[PDB]
Amino acid sequence: MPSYKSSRVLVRDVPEELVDHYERSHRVAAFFMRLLLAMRREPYSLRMRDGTEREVDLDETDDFLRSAGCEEPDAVSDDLRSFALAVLHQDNPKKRAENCVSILCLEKTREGMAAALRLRERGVFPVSVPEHLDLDSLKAAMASAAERLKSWLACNQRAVDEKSELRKRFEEALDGVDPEKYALFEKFAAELQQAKKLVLAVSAKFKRGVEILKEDGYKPLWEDFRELGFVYLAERKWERRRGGAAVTLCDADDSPIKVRFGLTGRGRKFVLSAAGSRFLITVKLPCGDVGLTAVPSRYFWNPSVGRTTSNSFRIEFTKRTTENRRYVGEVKEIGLVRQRGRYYFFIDYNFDPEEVSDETKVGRAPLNESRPKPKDKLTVMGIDLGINPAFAFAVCTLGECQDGIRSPVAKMEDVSFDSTGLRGGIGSQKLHREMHNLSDRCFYGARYIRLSKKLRDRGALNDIEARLLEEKYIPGFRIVHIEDADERRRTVGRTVKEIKQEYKRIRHQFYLRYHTSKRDRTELISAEYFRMLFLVKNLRNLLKSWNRYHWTTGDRERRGGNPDELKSYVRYYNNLRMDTLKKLTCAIVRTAKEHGATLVAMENIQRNSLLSLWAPGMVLERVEQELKNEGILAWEVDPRHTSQTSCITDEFGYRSLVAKDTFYFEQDRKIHRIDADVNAAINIARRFLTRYRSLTQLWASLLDDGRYLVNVTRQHERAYLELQTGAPAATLNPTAEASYELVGLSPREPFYRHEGVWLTREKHRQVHELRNQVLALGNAKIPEIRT
RNA sequence: GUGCUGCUGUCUCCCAGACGGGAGGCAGAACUGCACCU
C-alpha cells in the first residue's frame, strides 16, 4: 500500500567484525539459493562471472541434496518440492504457506509448513549450513536469495509461456496438412541450408534459392508458397528459442547483494543518530556494536532522526536541488552493499504523498457505463509519452472555457486547450543529431563485423549478403572494403577506435552541459538523454562484437573465463537509464503541478522508441507512482490513431512522414496544419474527456452473403455501435460510393470511419489523396494554430 | 552519499596481434551545477 524511496550513505573506515559478517552473509545466501534451486529437481542452465552457461543434470541435483544431508532426496522429493514451492511464491496466494529460516536452520494449514514438519520428523529436513552465523543474518540472507529466486521462477514461467505460444503458433500453421509433403519440404530445406523474406519473395507461382524450387527436385508439390513456407518458418521459430530462464549466483565481488538491517527483526537491530550534519550508525551484532561515520550526504544535507511508537526511525532532511526542498518519512531498514570496496548503508523509508480529495478520484469508463461526473472545476492535463518530446502537454479546465482549441466532453460543456507546448525537446540542434549519427554508426558496425567474419571464413555465400553490404552496412560504417582479411581487420580496429574517440567527445561535451555558465538554461530533461542511451546500447554491442572477431563463424563457446567484460559500459548505460527515467519523472511532475493537473492522461504505449530502452511497462508504472507520490492522479489512454486523427474536426489525417512533428487536417473545406505532438496531446485528452465517443477503426469479417459482420473485443467497441447504430452489433452493408455503413443485426478485415462511409483498408489508404493534396498546396500556405 | 560524469598524468592484469579493445589503482586539476527505491 505505502510507497518507497531510498538513498545510500558511505562508511569509510569499517571494522572487520562486520566485514566478516558481510562475507558470511554472502556465502550463506549463495548456498541457500542453490539449495532452493535444487530442491525441485527440474534441471536448468546456470552461470558464473564467466558468463557462458554450463548445464546441470538430475544426478548433480541428487548429489547436492545428498551433501545437504538427505539420504534419498528422490524418495522424499515430494515434500521437499512442495515446501520449496510454498516458500518461493511459486503457487497461488491461498496456497502460499524470509520466514522459513526458523524451520530450516533450527537444530533443537498450508502444504508447505506441513511438508517441512514432515521432512523434519521424517529425519530429512535439517540441512548443514556451510558457515556459522546468527539466525537473523540467516533470515536476511534467505530473504535476498529467495527474492532473486522469485525473480528467476517468474522469468522461467515467462519462458515456458513463450515456448508454449511458439508451439501453438506453429501447430496452427502445420494443422496436420500433408505431413509427408511437409517432410519433403524439409528435404528441400536440406538443400536450402546447404545451397521468411524468401517466402515473401515467392509472390507468384512462376537466385538458386528461387531457382531450385522450380526444378523437378522439389517440383512435385508446388502447391502454394503461403501454406508452403509459413509452416517451415513457424517450425524453425519453435526450434530456435530458449525455453528456460537461466540463473546467476550471488557473489560478493561479482554478484553482490544487500545485507539488510532493521528493527523488525529481519537482521540485526540498529540505532540511527545524527550530529554535525552527518548520520552515525550503530548496529547490534552478536559480538557487540560498532560506530560508523556515515559521510554527510547532500540527499540528507541537514538531517535528523527520531524513534517512533511504530517501531520505526522517523527522519527529516533537505534535498539539494534547484532550491532547498524539504522531505520527511519513517526509516525502518538499512542495507550494506560493498561495491568496489566501499561499504554503503542503504537507507529505506516510507513517506506520505500529498493529500487528495475524492473530488479528484471521482473524475479519475466505457460509454455503456454510467457513473457520476466531476462536479468540480478541475483541470485535465495531457501527457504524450514519446522520444523527441519527453511529454507533449495541454491542460484544459473543465467547468471553464476562454479560448484556444475547443474540445467537447462527455455530458458536460466545452473545454478549451489553452496552455500547450513541449517538454523535453532537443537541448541542441547539433548534439542530438551527432549523437543519433553515432548510435546508427554503432548499430551498423556491429553487423558489418559479423559480415566480414563470414566473408573471411567462407567468401560471399549468396547475393543478398553483398546487397546488404553495398546498401546498408557499408554506408552505416563508412569504411573502404578490402578483399584481403588482414587490412580489413585493422580497418575494423581503426573504426572502433574512431567510434571510441567520438564517444569521448560527445560524453565530454554532454557532461559540461551542467557546469558551464549556461547551467541555469539547461533543461531538466531532453531528447539527448534518450539518444545517448541508444548510442551506449549499440556501442556496447559494437565492442562486444570487436571482442569476438578473431575466431571463426562456426564457434559457439568462450575461449576463456575472463570475467567483467565491458561491464563499465553496462553500468554506465544502466545508471543513465535510471537517471533519465528519474529526470523524465521530475519534468512531468514539475510541468503538471504548476498547472494543477488534477487529472492526467497518458497514452498506453504498451500497445527506436521507449519500448526498446525500457520494458514496455516500467516507464508507465514508475511514472504513475511518481506522479501519484505528488498527489496527482495519472491515467492511461489507448493510442490507436491518437496520432493520425484531428483534434479540431474529428477526422483521420496525415502525420507527415518527413515533417515528423507536423500534423495536417481540414476544416470547413480548408486545409490547416498543427504540431503533431501537441495534436496528439490533445487527442489523448479528448479521448479521456469524451469517454471515447468517436471510434475510427473496426475489424469485420465475412462468411457469406457478401456483407461483413462487426467484431466484439472491447466494451468500448460494443458501446460505439449502440451510440451510432442502435444495436449491439451491425454489419458493413455497401453503398454506391464504394463505401459501407452500419445497419445493425438480428438473431476480420480493416474498416475505418472516415465520415461514416467506412472506407475499408484499401479505400482508406483516401488518406493518401489527402497526403497528395496537402503536399501539393504547400505547407507554408497552411494555417498553423496555437502550439 | 548514488548517479548524470567527467577530464589530464601515471601504475597494473586479460583478450587480441601489430590495428586495437576489455578491466581496475593512484595522483592532480576543472566545478560546485541537475535529479534521486531497482
XYZ file of C-alpha atoms in Angstrom, chain A residues 311-678:
368
model
C 8.937 0.846 15.958
C 10.368 2.953 13.130
C 13.029 5.657 12.903
C 11.458 8.909 11.743
C 13.893 11.233 9.976
C 13.802 14.549 8.134
C 16.192 16.004 5.577
C 16.666 18.631 2.874
C 17.415 17.506 -0.678
C 19.811 19.634 -2.714
C 18.049 20.705 -5.923
C 17.406 23.899 -7.863
C 16.160 25.113 -4.465
C 16.166 23.855 -0.877
C 13.292 21.378 -0.612
C 12.068 19.502 2.448
C 11.139 15.860 2.969
C 10.162 13.554 5.831
C 9.432 9.888 6.425
C 9.876 6.845 8.629
C 13.040 4.739 8.309
C 12.667 1.044 9.139
C 15.519 -0.790 7.370
C 19.139 -0.224 6.350
C 21.290 -2.130 3.885
C 25.022 -2.718 3.428
C 26.327 -3.145 -0.130
C 30.069 -3.431 -0.779
C 30.518 -2.015 -4.275
C 34.144 -1.810 -5.443
C 35.360 -1.954 -1.848
C 33.444 0.895 -0.193
C 30.713 -0.052 2.277
C 27.437 1.816 1.699
C 24.457 1.874 4.069
C 21.262 1.770 2.013
C 18.557 3.856 3.711
C 14.902 2.885 3.261
C 11.733 4.598 4.453
C 8.065 5.268 3.792
C 6.593 8.733 3.410
C 3.152 10.168 2.805
C 2.124 11.555 -0.582
C 0.327 14.874 -0.788
C -3.358 14.938 0.063
C -6.055 14.134 -2.499
C -9.762 14.933 -2.296
C -12.351 12.462 -3.537
C -13.483 15.161 -5.969
C -10.395 14.088 -7.913
C -10.921 10.338 -7.546
C -14.496 10.542 -8.830
C -13.382 12.115 -12.096
C -10.393 9.783 -12.296
C -15.189 4.309 -18.041
C -16.925 2.920 -21.148
C -19.753 4.916 -22.675
C -22.035 1.941 -21.990
C -21.355 2.543 -18.274
C -22.880 5.399 -16.270
C -21.064 6.915 -13.289
C -21.218 10.391 -11.720
C -19.444 13.414 -13.173
C -16.662 15.570 -11.689
C -18.979 18.082 -10.021
C -15.844 20.189 -9.565
C -13.857 22.684 -11.637
C -10.776 20.520 -12.049
C -8.030 20.746 -14.669
C -7.238 17.871 -17.039
C -3.724 17.799 -18.488
C -2.268 15.959 -21.467
C 0.832 13.775 -21.394
C 2.119 12.248 -24.641
C 4.997 9.916 -23.820
C 7.491 9.885 -26.659
C 11.114 10.391 -27.617
C 11.508 13.769 -29.310
C 9.183 15.361 -26.760
C 9.558 13.908 -23.283
C 5.848 14.706 -22.974
C 3.743 16.997 -25.130
C 1.238 18.669 -22.836
C -2.074 20.501 -22.845
C -4.275 21.372 -19.863
C -7.899 22.461 -20.211
C -10.013 23.341 -17.182
C -13.361 21.557 -17.085
C -16.035 23.923 -15.894
C -14.492 26.784 -17.877
C -13.801 27.883 -21.446
C -11.987 31.006 -22.657
C -10.183 30.456 -25.981
C -7.916 28.013 -27.794
C -8.761 24.591 -29.177
C -12.371 23.804 -28.286
C -12.797 20.130 -27.433
C -16.105 18.501 -26.447
C -16.537 16.330 -23.379
C -18.916 13.589 -22.312
C -22.092 15.077 -20.821
C -20.592 18.467 -19.944
C -19.864 21.771 -21.646
C -16.905 22.512 -23.899
C -13.396 22.940 -22.523
C -10.537 24.927 -24.047
C -6.995 23.613 -24.568
C -5.097 26.860 -23.982
C -1.770 26.018 -22.296
C 0.195 23.931 -24.786
C 3.771 23.168 -25.714
C 6.523 20.595 -25.434
C 8.801 19.455 -22.620
C 11.970 17.506 -23.305
C 12.957 18.730 -26.741
C 16.418 18.754 -28.239
C 18.784 20.668 -25.996
C 20.896 21.412 -29.063
C 20.393 21.423 -32.816
C 23.767 19.659 -33.064
C 24.320 17.431 -30.029
C 21.262 15.235 -30.564
C 21.944 14.945 -34.298
C 25.589 13.942 -33.830
C 24.556 11.554 -31.061
C 21.956 9.839 -33.265
C 24.541 9.588 -36.044
C 26.949 7.802 -33.708
C 24.221 5.452 -32.463
C 23.325 4.430 -36.024
C 27.018 4.027 -36.817
C 27.290 1.600 -33.905
C 24.184 -0.310 -34.981
C 25.716 -0.801 -38.430
C 29.307 -1.601 -37.479
C 28.051 -4.223 -35.034
C 26.718 -6.158 -38.039
C 29.485 -5.453 -40.534
C 31.856 -7.165 -38.095
C 29.826 -10.370 -38.485
C 29.614 -9.814 -42.237
C 33.400 -9.582 -42.572
C 33.815 -12.571 -40.256
C 31.679 -14.731 -42.533
C 33.288 -13.339 -45.687
C 36.782 -14.100 -44.386
C 35.773 -17.586 -43.254
C 33.983 -18.678 -46.428
C 33.654 -15.948 -49.063
C 30.450 -14.444 -50.402
C 27.804 -17.014 -49.515
C 24.957 -15.551 -51.605
C 23.683 -12.413 -53.311
C 21.662 -10.734 -50.557
C 24.811 -10.688 -48.425
C 26.559 -8.486 -50.995
C 23.380 -6.455 -51.491
C 23.260 -5.636 -47.777
C 27.000 -4.946 -47.816
C 26.636 -2.378 -50.590
C 23.319 -0.932 -49.392
C 23.005 -0.775 -45.591
C 26.186 -1.554 -43.653
C 28.999 -0.059 -45.761
C 27.271 3.350 -45.559
C 26.362 2.686 -41.924
C 30.053 2.100 -41.191
C 31.599 4.351 -43.887
C 34.725 2.277 -44.454
C 36.573 1.072 -47.526
C 36.064 -2.573 -48.486
C 39.261 -4.594 -48.944
C 39.358 -8.101 -50.398
C 42.118 -9.217 -48.030
C 41.327 -10.075 -44.416
C 44.248 -8.540 -42.501
C 43.758 -4.976 -43.735
C 40.001 -5.336 -43.258
C 40.575 -6.457 -39.660
C 42.853 -3.498 -38.980
C 40.251 -1.204 -40.558
C 37.664 -2.636 -38.172
C 40.022 -1.777 -35.327
C 40.594 1.732 -36.677
C 36.868 2.418 -36.929
C 36.386 1.017 -33.424
C 38.970 3.480 -32.104
C 37.319 6.326 -34.013
C 33.938 5.463 -32.507
C 35.621 5.418 -29.095
C 37.003 8.919 -29.660
C 33.635 10.228 -30.865
C 32.016 8.684 -27.788
C 34.537 10.538 -25.633
C 33.905 13.806 -27.489
C 30.136 13.523 -27.045
C 30.434 12.356 -23.438
C 32.689 15.284 -22.538
C 30.548 17.914 -24.256
C 27.444 16.404 -22.640
C 28.886 16.421 -19.119
C 29.811 20.113 -19.367
C 26.172 20.975 -20.091
C 25.615 21.078 -16.321
C 28.711 23.074 -15.273
C 29.473 25.836 -17.780
C 27.947 29.302 -17.294
C 24.870 28.001 -19.159
C 23.889 25.852 -16.139
C 20.679 27.780 -15.491
C 19.322 27.365 -19.029
C 19.962 23.607 -19.243
C 16.573 21.909 -19.293
C 15.664 19.306 -16.695
C 15.090 16.688 -19.426
C 15.748 16.459 -23.155
C 15.866 14.021 -26.058
C 19.642 13.989 -25.594
C 19.312 11.552 -22.700
C 17.384 9.067 -24.839
C 19.645 9.389 -27.863
C 22.854 8.810 -25.898
C 21.055 5.897 -24.230
C 20.620 4.433 -27.712
C 24.238 5.281 -28.505
C 25.536 3.371 -25.495
C 23.145 0.462 -26.063
C 24.544 -0.026 -29.564
C 28.177 0.786 -28.737
C 28.090 -1.994 -26.158
C 27.220 -4.422 -28.950
C 29.754 -2.957 -31.376
C 32.543 -3.569 -28.879
C 31.213 -6.953 -27.708
C 31.483 -7.851 -31.386
C 35.026 -6.495 -31.668
C 35.964 -8.733 -28.724
C 34.832 -11.825 -30.670
C 36.183 -11.187 -34.175
C 39.437 -13.157 -34.086
C 37.640 -16.508 -34.175
C 35.730 -18.267 -36.943
C 31.990 -18.285 -37.633
C 31.131 -21.840 -36.550
C 32.261 -21.365 -32.950
C 29.774 -21.262 -30.085
C 31.800 -21.139 -26.842
C 34.015 -18.794 -24.854
C 37.769 -19.247 -25.238
C 38.438 -18.351 -21.595
C 36.700 -17.469 -18.347
C 37.626 -13.787 -18.386
C 35.032 -12.007 -16.201
C 33.859 -8.400 -16.069
C 33.887 -7.890 -19.840
C 32.575 -4.471 -20.915
C 30.864 -4.132 -17.532
C 31.874 -0.466 -17.317
C 29.661 0.325 -20.307
C 26.796 -1.779 -18.956
C 26.957 0.053 -15.632
C 27.089 3.416 -17.413
C 24.070 2.535 -19.543
C 22.027 1.306 -16.583
C 22.883 4.263 -14.347
C 21.933 6.513 -17.247
C 18.638 4.704 -17.718
C 17.772 5.171 -14.049
C 18.798 8.835 -14.087
C 16.895 9.587 -17.298
C 13.753 7.884 -16.028
C 14.017 9.952 -12.845
C 14.547 13.130 -14.868
C 11.503 12.479 -17.053
C 9.578 11.820 -13.842
C 10.739 15.142 -12.411
C 9.937 17.080 -15.585
C 6.438 15.599 -15.729
C 5.749 16.410 -12.074
C 7.055 19.957 -12.478
C 5.083 20.696 -15.647
C 1.995 19.126 -14.031
C 1.922 20.673 -10.537
C 2.041 24.340 -11.531
C -0.936 23.833 -13.844
C -2.784 21.867 -11.163
C -3.036 18.742 -13.315
C -5.695 17.243 -11.063
C -6.174 14.564 -13.769
C -3.522 13.434 -16.258
C -3.987 11.300 -19.379
C -1.006 9.434 -20.826
C -1.202 7.055 -23.762
C -0.813 3.333 -23.112
C 2.453 2.950 -25.009
C 2.198 -0.778 -24.247
C 0.107 -1.055 -27.431
C 13.745 3.469 -31.849
C 11.062 4.093 -29.226
C 10.503 3.926 -25.471
C 9.650 0.227 -25.691
C 13.205 -0.533 -26.812
C 15.082 1.215 -23.986
C 12.696 0.074 -21.236
C 10.453 -2.902 -20.773
C 7.011 -1.827 -22.006
C 5.533 -1.346 -18.541
C 8.233 0.076 -16.279
C 8.034 3.583 -17.760
C 4.291 3.876 -17.193
C 4.384 2.127 -13.813
C 7.064 4.338 -12.290
C 5.612 7.481 -13.877
C 2.242 6.678 -12.310
C 3.984 6.048 -8.986
C 5.947 9.314 -9.007
C 3.016 11.423 -10.184
C 0.977 9.646 -7.524
C 3.534 10.360 -4.812
C 2.977 14.028 -5.552
C -0.795 13.887 -5.104
C -1.590 13.878 -8.813
C -3.690 11.040 -10.225
C -2.473 9.963 -13.667
C -4.259 7.753 -16.204
C -3.524 5.708 -19.332
C -5.196 6.015 -22.747
C -5.362 3.902 -25.911
C -3.067 5.435 -28.573
C -4.821 3.816 -31.557
C -4.896 6.553 -34.238
C -4.496 9.145 -31.493
C -1.551 10.302 -33.633
C -3.199 10.369 -37.077
C -6.637 11.921 -36.434
C -7.545 15.575 -35.965
C -8.377 17.387 -32.735
C -10.477 20.125 -34.351
C -12.632 18.196 -36.867
C -12.690 14.604 -35.534
C -11.440 13.049 -38.751
C -8.445 10.989 -39.868
C -5.401 12.879 -41.121
C -1.800 12.786 -42.314
C 1.128 12.844 -39.884
C 3.945 13.950 -42.162
C 6.482 11.154 -42.554
C 9.140 13.762 -43.423
C 7.888 16.715 -41.352
C 7.719 14.308 -38.452
C 6.466 16.897 -35.953
C 3.696 18.496 -38.050
C 0.153 17.181 -38.469
C -2.424 18.043 -41.116
C -6.217 18.308 -41.086
C -9.031 20.008 -42.988
C -11.907 22.024 -41.520
C -14.622 23.980 -43.326
C -13.183 22.727 -46.627
C -9.905 24.446 -45.698
C -6.557 22.762 -45.037
C -4.961 23.573 -41.675
C -1.677 22.455 -40.112
C -0.753 21.821 -36.488
C 2.124 20.382 -34.455
C 1.549 16.627 -34.484
C 2.896 16.303 -30.949
C 0.558 18.918 -29.461
